[PDB]
Amino acid sequence: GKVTRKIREETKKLRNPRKLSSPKYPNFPETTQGTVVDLVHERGRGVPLAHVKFNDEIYSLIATEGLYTGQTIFIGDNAPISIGNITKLKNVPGGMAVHSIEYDYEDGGCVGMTGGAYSTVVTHREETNETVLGLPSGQKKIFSSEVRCIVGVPSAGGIKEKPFLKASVAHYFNKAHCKKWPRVRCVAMNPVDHKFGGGNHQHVGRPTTISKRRPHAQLMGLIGARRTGRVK
Amino acid sequence: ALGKPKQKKSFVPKLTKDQKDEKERLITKKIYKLAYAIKRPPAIQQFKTILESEDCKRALALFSKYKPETHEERLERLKKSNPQEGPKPILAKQGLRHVTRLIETKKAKFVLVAADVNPAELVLFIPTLCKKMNIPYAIVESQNMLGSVVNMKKTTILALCDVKGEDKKELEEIIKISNEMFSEQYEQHMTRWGG
RNA sequence: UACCCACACAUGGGAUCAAUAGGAUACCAUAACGAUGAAGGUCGUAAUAGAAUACGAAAGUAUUUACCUAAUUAAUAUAUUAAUGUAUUGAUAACCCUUUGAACUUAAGCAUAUCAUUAAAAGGAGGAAAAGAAACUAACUAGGAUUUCUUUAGUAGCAGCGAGUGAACAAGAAAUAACCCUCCAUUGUAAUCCUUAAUUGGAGUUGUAAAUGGUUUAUUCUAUUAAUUAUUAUAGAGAAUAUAUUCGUUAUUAAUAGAAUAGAAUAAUGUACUUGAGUAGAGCUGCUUGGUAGUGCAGUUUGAAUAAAGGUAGAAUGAAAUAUCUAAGGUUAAAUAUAAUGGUAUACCGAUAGAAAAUAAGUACUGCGAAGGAACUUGUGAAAAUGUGUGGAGUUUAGCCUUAUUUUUAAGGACCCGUCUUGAAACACGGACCAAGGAGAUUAUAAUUAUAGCAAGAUAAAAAUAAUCUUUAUUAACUUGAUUAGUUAUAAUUAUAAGACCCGAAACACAGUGAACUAUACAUGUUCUGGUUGAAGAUAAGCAAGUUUAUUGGAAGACCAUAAUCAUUCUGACGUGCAAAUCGAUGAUUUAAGAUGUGUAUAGUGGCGAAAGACCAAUCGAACUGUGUGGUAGCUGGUUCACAGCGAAAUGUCUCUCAGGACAGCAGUUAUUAUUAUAUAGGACAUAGAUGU
RNA sequence: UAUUUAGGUAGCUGUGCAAUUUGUUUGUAUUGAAGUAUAUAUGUGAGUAUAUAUAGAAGAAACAAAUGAGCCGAUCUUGGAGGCAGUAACAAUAUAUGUAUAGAUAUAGACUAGGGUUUUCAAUUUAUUGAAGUGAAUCGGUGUUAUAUAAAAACAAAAAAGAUUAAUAAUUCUUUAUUAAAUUAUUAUAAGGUAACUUGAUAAUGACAGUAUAUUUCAAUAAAUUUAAGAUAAAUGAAUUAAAUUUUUAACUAUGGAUUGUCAUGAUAAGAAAUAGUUAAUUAUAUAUACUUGAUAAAAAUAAAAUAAUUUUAACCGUACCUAUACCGCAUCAGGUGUCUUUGUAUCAUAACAAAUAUUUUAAAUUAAAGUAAGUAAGGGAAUUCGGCAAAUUAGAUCUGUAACUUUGGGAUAAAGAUUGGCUCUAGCAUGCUAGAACUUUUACUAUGUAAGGAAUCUGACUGUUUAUUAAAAACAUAGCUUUUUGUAUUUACAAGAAGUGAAUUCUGCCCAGUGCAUUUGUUAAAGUUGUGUAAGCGAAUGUAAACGGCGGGAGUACUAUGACUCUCUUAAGGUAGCCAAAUGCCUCGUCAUUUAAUUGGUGACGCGCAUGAAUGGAGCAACGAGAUUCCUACUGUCCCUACUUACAAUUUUGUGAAACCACGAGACAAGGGAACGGGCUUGUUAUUUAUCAGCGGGGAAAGAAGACCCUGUUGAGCUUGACUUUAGUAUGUUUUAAUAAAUAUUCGAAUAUUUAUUUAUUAGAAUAUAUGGGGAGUUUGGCUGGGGCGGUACAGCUGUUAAAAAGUAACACAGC
Numbered sequence A: 001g002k003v004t005r006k007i008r009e010e011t012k013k014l015r016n017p018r019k020l021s022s023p024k025y026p027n028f029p030e031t032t033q034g035t036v037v038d039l040v041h042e043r044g045r046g047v048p049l050a051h052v053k054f055n056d057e058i059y060s061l062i063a064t065e066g067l068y069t070g071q072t073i074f075i076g077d078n079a080p081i082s083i084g085n086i087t088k089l090k091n092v093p094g095g096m097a098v099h100s101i102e103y104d105y106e107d108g109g110c111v112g113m114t115g116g117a118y119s120t121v122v123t124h125r126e127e128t129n130e131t132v133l134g135l136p137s138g139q140k141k142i143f144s145s146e147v148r149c150i151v152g153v154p155s156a157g158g159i160k161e162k163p164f165l166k167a168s169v170a171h172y173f174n175k176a177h178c179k180k181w182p183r184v185r186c187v188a189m190n191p192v193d194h195k196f197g198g199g200n201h202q203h204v205g206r207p208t209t210i211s212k213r214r215p216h217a218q219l220m221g222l223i224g225a226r227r228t229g230r231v232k
Numbered sequence B: 001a002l003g004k005p006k007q008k009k010s011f012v013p014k015l016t017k018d019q020k021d022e023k024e025r026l027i028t029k030k031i032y033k034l035a036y037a038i039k040r041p042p043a044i045q046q047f048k049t050i051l052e053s054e055d056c057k058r059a060l061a062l063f064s065k066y067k068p069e070t071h072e073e074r075l076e077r078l079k080k081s082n083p084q085e086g087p088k089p090i091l092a093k094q095g096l097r098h099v100t101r102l103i104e105t106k107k108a109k110f111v112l113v114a115a116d117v118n119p120a121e122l123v124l125f126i127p128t129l130c131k132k133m134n135i136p137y138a139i140v141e142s143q144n145m146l147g148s149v150v151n152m153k154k155t156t157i158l159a160l161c162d163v164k165g166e167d168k169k170e171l172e173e174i175i176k177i178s179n180e181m182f183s184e185q186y187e188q189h190m191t192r193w194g195g
Numbered sequence C: 001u002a003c004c005c006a007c008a009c010a011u012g013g014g015a016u017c018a019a020u021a022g023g024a025u026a027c028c029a030u031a032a033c034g035a036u037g038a039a040g041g042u043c044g045u046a047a048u049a050g051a052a053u054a055c056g057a058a059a060g061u062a063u064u065u066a067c068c069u070a071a072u073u074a075a076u077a078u079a080u081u082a083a084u085g086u087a088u089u090g091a092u093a094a095c096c097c098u099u100u101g102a103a104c105u106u107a108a109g110c111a112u113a114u115c116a117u118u119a120a121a122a123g124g125a126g127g128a129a130a131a132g133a134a135a136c137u138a139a140c141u142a143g144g145a146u147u148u149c150u151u152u153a154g155u156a157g158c159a160g161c162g163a164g165u166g167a168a169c170a171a172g173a174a175a176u177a178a179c180c181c182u183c184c185a186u187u188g189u190a191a192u193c194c195u196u197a198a199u200u201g202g203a204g205u206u207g208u209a210a211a212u213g214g215u216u217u218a219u220u221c222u223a224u225u226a227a228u229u230a231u232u233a234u235a236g237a238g239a240a241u242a243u244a245u246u247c248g249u250u251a252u253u254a255a256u257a258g259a260a261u262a263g264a265a266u267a268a269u270g271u272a273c274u275u276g277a278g279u280a281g282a283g284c285u286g287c288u289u290g291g292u293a294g295u296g297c298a299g300u301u302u303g304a305a306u307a308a309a310g311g312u313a314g315a316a317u318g319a320a321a322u323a324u325c326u327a328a329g330g331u332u333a334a335a336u337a338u339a340a341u342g343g344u345a346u347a348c349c350g351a352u353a354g355a356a357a358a359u360a361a362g363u364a365c366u367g368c369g370a371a372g373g374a375a376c377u378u379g380u381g382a383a384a385a386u387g388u389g390u391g392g393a394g395u396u397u398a399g400c401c402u403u404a405u406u407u408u409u410a411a412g413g414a415c416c417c418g419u420c421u422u423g424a425a426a427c428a429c430g431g432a433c434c435a436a437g438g439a440g441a442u443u444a445u446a447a448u449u450a451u452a453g454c455a456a457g458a459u460a461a462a463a464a465u466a467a468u469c470u471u472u473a474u475u476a477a478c479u480u481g482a483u484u485a486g487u488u489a490u491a492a493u494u495a496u497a498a499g500a501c502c503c504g505a506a507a508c509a510c511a512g513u514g515a516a517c518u519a520u521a522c523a524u525g526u527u528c529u530g531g532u533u534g535a536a537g538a539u540a541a542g543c544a545a546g547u548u549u550a551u552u553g554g555a556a557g558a559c560c561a562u563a564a565u566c567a568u569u570c571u572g573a574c575g576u577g578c579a580a581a582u583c584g585a586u587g588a589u590u591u592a593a594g595a596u597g598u599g600u601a602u603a604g605u606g607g608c609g610a611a612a613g614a615c616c617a618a619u620c621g622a623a624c625u626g627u628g629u630g631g632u633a634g635c636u637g638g639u640u641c642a643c644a645g646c647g648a649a650a651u652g653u654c655u656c657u658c659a660g661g662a663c664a665g666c667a668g669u670u671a672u673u674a675u676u677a678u679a680u681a682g683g684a685c686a687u688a689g690a691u692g693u
Numbered sequence D: 001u002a003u004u005u006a007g008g009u010a011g012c013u014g015u016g017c018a019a020u021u022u023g024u025u026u027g028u029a030u031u032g033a034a035g036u037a038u039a040u041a042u043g044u045g046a047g048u049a050u051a052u053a054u055a056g057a058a059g060a061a062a063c064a065a066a067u068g069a070g071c072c073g074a075u076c077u078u079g080g081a082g083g084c085a086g087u088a089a090c091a092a093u094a095u096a097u098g099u100a101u102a103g104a105u106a107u108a109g110a111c112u113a114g115g116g117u118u119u120u121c122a123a124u125u126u127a128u129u130g131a132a133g134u135g136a137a138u139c140g141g142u143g144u145u146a147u148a149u150a151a152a153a154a155c156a157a158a159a160a161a162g163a164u165u166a167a168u169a170a171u172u173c174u175u176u177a178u179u180a181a182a183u184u185a186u187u188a189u190a191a192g193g194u195a196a197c198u199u200g201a202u203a204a205u206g207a208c209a210g211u212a213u214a215u216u217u218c219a220a221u222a223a224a225u226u227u228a229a230g231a232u233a234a235a236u237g238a239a240u241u242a243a244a245u246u247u248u249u250a251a252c253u254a255u256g257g258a259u260u261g262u263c264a265u266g267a268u269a270a271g272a273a274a275u276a277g278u279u280a281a282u283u284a285u286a287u288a289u290a291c292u293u294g295a296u297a298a299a300a301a302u303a304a305a306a307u308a309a310u311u312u313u314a315a316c317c318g319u320a321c322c323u324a325u326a327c328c329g330c331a332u333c334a335g336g337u338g339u340c341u342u343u344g345u346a347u348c349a350u351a352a353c354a355a356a357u358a359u360u361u362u363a364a365a366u367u368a369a370a371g372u373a374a375g376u377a378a379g380g381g382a383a384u385u386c387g388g389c390a391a392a393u394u395a396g397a398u399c400u401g402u403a404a405c406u407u408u409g410g411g412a413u414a415a416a417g418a419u420u421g422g423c424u425c426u427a428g429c430a431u432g433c434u435a436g437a438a439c440u441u442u443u444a445c446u447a448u449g450u451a452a453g454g455a456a457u458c459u460g461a462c463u464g465u466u467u468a469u470u471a472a473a474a475a476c477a478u479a480g481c482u483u484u485u486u487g488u489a490u491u492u493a494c495a496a497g498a499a500g501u502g503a504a505u506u507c508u509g510c511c512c513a514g515u516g517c518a519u520u521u522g523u524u525a526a527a528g529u530u531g532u533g534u535a536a537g538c539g540a541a542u543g544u545a546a547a548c549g550g551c552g553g554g555a556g557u558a559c560u561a562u563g564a565c566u567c568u569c570u571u572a573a574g575g576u577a578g579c580c581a582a583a584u585g586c587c588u589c590g591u592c593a594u595u596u597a598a599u600u601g602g603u604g605a606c607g608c609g610c611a612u613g614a615a616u617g618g619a620g621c622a623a624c625g626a627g628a629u630u631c632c633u634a635c636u637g638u639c640c641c642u643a644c645u646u647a648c649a650a651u652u653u654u655g656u657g658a659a660a661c662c663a664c665g666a667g668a669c670a671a672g673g674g675a676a677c678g679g680g681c682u683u684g685u686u687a688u689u690u691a692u693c694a695g696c697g698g699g700g701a702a703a704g705a706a707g708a709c710c711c712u713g714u715u716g717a718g719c720u721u722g723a724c725u726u727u728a729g730u731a732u733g734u735u736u737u738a739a740u741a742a743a744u745a746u747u748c749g750a751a752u753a754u755u756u757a758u759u760u761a762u763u764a765g766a767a768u769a770u771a772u773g774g775g776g777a778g779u780u781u782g783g784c785u786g787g788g789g790c791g792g793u794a795c796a797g798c799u800g801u802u803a804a805a806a807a808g809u810a811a812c813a814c815a816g817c
């Protein structure tokens, strides 16, 4: 046969990988004050970024919900908690919304980068100095304290309301996000290109649930499912 | 081939004359924290006694009485008709491969050993060999100090065969302070595990 | 007038015969490149210059040497004080030493095996290279470093024990040669070593030690230049001119360079007790060899003794006697193998032959590229195919055989050759016509027949002036044992292996070139004109929380045309075409998921794809160029002179056998011998019998 | 002394002729060798010898030797030359005197890619030879970069006229300018305005989408005037052509204190109108507003300034010519190839015609047939045909009028009617547009351009794309719906990978026995230790069908008939909601109705459905379609049944001048036998213009291509998998792993194992064993046979008959083991 589509797409990512910003905030020993300068828009991502200014140095950050040009925010380990400020994790009471959490201390940020997605805090445990967070995916993860984070819900709202009612709307989405579009179903192909292909009618003939035990080039279909079907 | 990009070649800078000396400092610093924390064998632990800084000066002031001839003196010594005129002169030997012949034939009377040598295996057997032939021995710090007598750069070992009559009493003063540091406590030096 | 025949004279073409500043094979000598700038390329120089050929601004006849090119104001390293000095880099197409490493093919299939310790590919040196002074061979009355030839030997042995593959000692020769470091080298003295005009500056005791004179004379050998040679002859090898002369041959000298031997003279002579460790060997694992249960090598784990010691002795382990040697550091001549370059010879070819090339030939010309690659000598003037003149027949019959002076007619006979085939003139295949070329030859090993030399023995083995066969005497072995005249050569036939009588596949592996056509992503530019319809938003006038009427406004993957683009129908035209996909009418299409120039990225078990197995230079269900390669074919086609003697089978058995093989039968050739005529017979008669149509 | 023997395919043996070279012996030739062409003799035959003509330098015989040693064929190799045949196929403007007067066809001109002397002139006849010709401080390259080799169209110091040459000209010459660098002469270091700002008095940028509307800058039209030109038998308030001269708004400042604008949306107590003033007005590739987006629309080199003057100061390379008869397709090829400019009439345009510019020389004709195009047709109107294939009808613009259905937007320009010229006026205001009226005629969008209409069924939602060269579609895509994996992403779950169906509306039933997938507690290798013990995986349990898939049969029971109801084999469950002789129904041209004079067609109903059925999706049509099918109206040479006219090829002449094919073809037939369909063989019947010309398609089983269909070969290749043998990747053991101290467990003071802490190590791997493993790699997949396949084994043994009185003998023949 020939090399299929999945392996040929990953080696096309090594010839020209996709490029993004990775915005991080600095670290400062005591509480300082900074000003918001302007709001911009990037090519790949939907959430707008913000340029703040600490000690006559301009950095880049993800914009929170209510933010206007010229406003003042504070950064430090013991800043007061309000909209757009960045404090330590232990100060916030249970029930609020944070949107950039570093895994360890003195890191930029790891969790909650996209627009419209936020996390919640559920508790504090004074023994061993740990707090449990509620991830946007729905899983409870235990975080160590003394990491610092930003208070508020991120901007850009709910983008998934109105559909791509035309085909032309989805053309410019996948082109900016560097994905392959359109896609051909694997049953329509000839049996050289794909395992499911060929035949006299369009059907599969093999079970579509494939274990994870098998090697890398044999993985296709619903890989390693614990369940299949509508629940009710 | 196979749709993979061409291989990429990185660059390196050549090290500057400050950068070479800087990196060699962090190599010798790491070793000095290493060798102390582990336990070293007893045969190396005996090489820590330097006897003093001050008591070295009495022995080197003895050996400078007996220096060998220079190169230019050696040719003028052969310009004379008879090369051997008078008695045999008393000298000081300075070689490692020659001194262990003298101790094995029991000719020597006083041996000085430099503990400065790297690699260290060359002089590990010296204090035990003098013990079997009843020779007094001593340890000085640097091999540059022994080369200062024989007008050489570095010298590992140094020993005398005999001395003159006038410095006889000056020699017996040295051996008493040398023996109470090493040979009277030799059986303790084998047992001490450095840790 | 046309058609046919006979004769004579002229066109067309380059066959035959004769020549030759060209090739092919074998042997001998040489075995000389490059940072002091190589091999190769591009551009220029002639008084009147294009091809070829020679040469660099000193340029078409002992120095110079334009510009690229390892191409270098560099790179990887060492020494001295960022600068200076030293060494390496590129070319090869034969022989040599390492690394990596296939498949076609044979087994009548194929998978272990064979082709093969091969081809392709990479690294490293010299005129030769590699090897080389026993941790050997043997069982004798014992031999003695390496290399090469003969022989042992197609043997012992290895292997689906099938096809097939395959060594050594002893014996006869060519050529000969042995040595040096590693300790404590006379410690009455580093006595050594590099560099500088200079103990000048260093190195070195963690150990360095290194005697020196090229003057002269004589002899021999090799290579290159220059000179003299009778017309009798140390010269009859051969060329050139015309129908008796020269160059040379033969035989002698000189000059330059190189090598070897000998003599004379000049320089020079102390002391020296070293023996090889992460090695040898074990356990697991993979390759290699004839090596069989290591013959040799390597990865991982583990890892000794020091001459009171260690290794080896053709089934395995353990033990014992008897022999015989001492590993793990270094150098080495001769006998041997083969190109580029120059010579000498020959039972080789003689212009469709010999090299692709008798050389304006690796040239003209082709391909995007890797690459592919011809014709033409000088005299004589054959056949095929035509022209002119003279003579002759008839219009109902080409050519051939027999018999006839009615021979440009008459009577009889007579379908076109080669080939497979039970059977061909066949409506079975090949062949329009002439010339030249064109297919069972060579080698190794066996056997039979004819001939020659010697014969209980036979012989040109390598070399220089021994072995083998008769005859391994049998057997697995022990126990035992006389006997069919041979051996060396010359010639013909047959069998097996070599490209193997000649030409012919679809395929497989190794090493390389292409995105100028066409596909996708990224960056940067350019992209004619007119109409139709009427969503949000906004304003007024009426009726009375709102609700009718009229304007303004100009959204949409909305509607329609020109220029530009595509390809539904006529199954129109054309169909040795205008054209290896075109032309005409009719149709579909419009601000976008469009069209298009240039630049960068993607390569053949790989890429790109709104998916038809479509496209990747007129080629795609695995592109193109060179090599292994004269790949294998139980299958089609062809196979060259006369006469004479003799003359078949299409049947039985076995076979992964049914389009093929082997054994038996039928045939031919040669040979020896007579009561095996006191004998035989696809017969008859007399006698004795078998049988179940 | 053959009175005896003599044919012969495959095949075996003997005696002889031809060619090239080698050793020895004998001999020929310039009064003429070898070769070649005609005769004669001789030999049974391969062959030999001599004679005559031509030519000009070497060749023959005997005894022995070495082989590249004798052609009719191979769709044999190379060269030369025939028939068909002067045949097919192409080219062919007028003048009695001319460097002119006319006719005819074609839009034309500049930069780049490609070509390389084709440019110009002279001499000799789209040729040959020989000279001459390309001039740069301001026109291109050389410079910067596109997130470790990139731009002659992106960015960047600066010029234009007017003339000269046989050919160069933003380059030569004249006139007026501009940039940069080096040397000279001179010098302000600040004033003024309340403010916006003015004058020598630094620190700025290169630099960035698309569409719509409003400005009418230029330019162009139109008018007037002034010089000039060309024509008409005549006539005309003075026609036609050429050149030039002319035809207030936006920001900001000071007073002011509440209104005001645009074609549209508005602006203002963060100060409107009205005044006074300071800056500018970007030249159509511009300015100001508005609109569409899960698309917001590149990089880097690059900076200073006042006035006058000077210069053997500004380097290197290309500058001719062609835009299709000077490129690519083997060519002087009806094909293909980036960008720009181009005059006049043309009441929406389009189409068409004319300007401008470039090329071009001489056969015949009222007459063939059959062709390739263009026209017309009395009466009938689809009767032709698989089918209205081809042609015909309709059409622009103004006014009335507009249905069923619906996803409420559409359907719709639905359908159906009426009007249209020319001239003379009247009436509106926006001044070149629109209504009405009178007069008149062989009646008016129609030269060119320009929708036939209606009623139903199947299938796809729509715009879109695809087999370059026989398939444009019902195939692919798409939004919409659903399932699954990942919390250690250069990117961070509204994100990143993997799959199925296919807009909206309405629905999505039952089964986990089989195969897969996930989760959790009997069998099984090696290495190590005195000895012993310990792996994953397989097996078992529990979930899962918008995972692969599946969804029965028989008997009685209420005048006949049927079975609501009952009984019964088993299984994982026994096809529910729906739908149909449908693109899915063999019997089959099913049964009934309707459409027609007549129907295997179409539509509506029926269902024990060979073999319908639910995201392998079921049911359904509003809008859309060069998709497939049937019927009405109009229309017509498709037909009844054909007829007439013109052009181009053809028939006739001159010039250039081929190919396929060819065993022999010299006249053709009836029957016979034959390899079972003769041009030739055997018996019969027969043609003939002095040797022709133009047609036609009965035959030569006519020509193209070593048949693609079928079979054989111990010949191949692409593809799949529960075929045979293995392998990359990956999972799990054992051994190697820095030291130290302590705790705990298991075995007997000791040996193992587990776990914690510190820093003194920490490049991150190596050697073996078991399992998984069509993601890959090699190769195989018998024979006989009334063709092969399916069926049987007549493929090994035994008995009786076939089998014909010794022995021997066939059939997918008989009866059996």
Ligand SMILES: [Mg+2]
Binding pocket: A188
């Ligand atoms: Mg398909």
Ligand SMILES: [Mg+2]
Binding pocket: A001, A191, A192, A194, A195
């Ligand atoms: Mg596959």
Ligand SMILES: [Mg+2]
Binding pocket: A202
């Ligand atoms: Mg489907």
Ligand SMILES: [Mg+2]
Binding pocket: C105
């Ligand atoms: Mg071969």
Ligand SMILES: [Mg+2]
Binding pocket: C107
């Ligand atoms: Mg085989």
Ligand SMILES: [Mg+2]
Binding pocket: C108
């Ligand atoms: Mg074979």
Ligand SMILES: [Mg+2]
Binding pocket: none
């Ligand atoms: Mg085979």
Ligand SMILES: [Mg+2]
Binding pocket: C116, C117
């Ligand atoms: Mg091998």
Ligand SMILES: [Mg+2]
Binding pocket: none
């Ligand atoms: Mg040699």
Ligand SMILES: [Mg+2]
Binding pocket: none
């Ligand atoms: Mg050597």
Ligand SMILES: [Mg+2]
Binding pocket: none
């Ligand atoms: Mg071998």
Ligand SMILES: [Mg+2]
Binding pocket: none
């Ligand atoms: Mg020494």
Ligand SMILES: [Mg+2]
Binding pocket: C229
């Ligand atoms: Mg002479």
Ligand SMILES: [Mg+2]
Binding pocket: C275
């Ligand atoms: Mg030894």
Ligand SMILES: [Mg+2]
Binding pocket: none
């Ligand atoms: Mg010849």
Ligand SMILES: [Mg+2]
Binding pocket: none
């Ligand atoms: Mg030749």
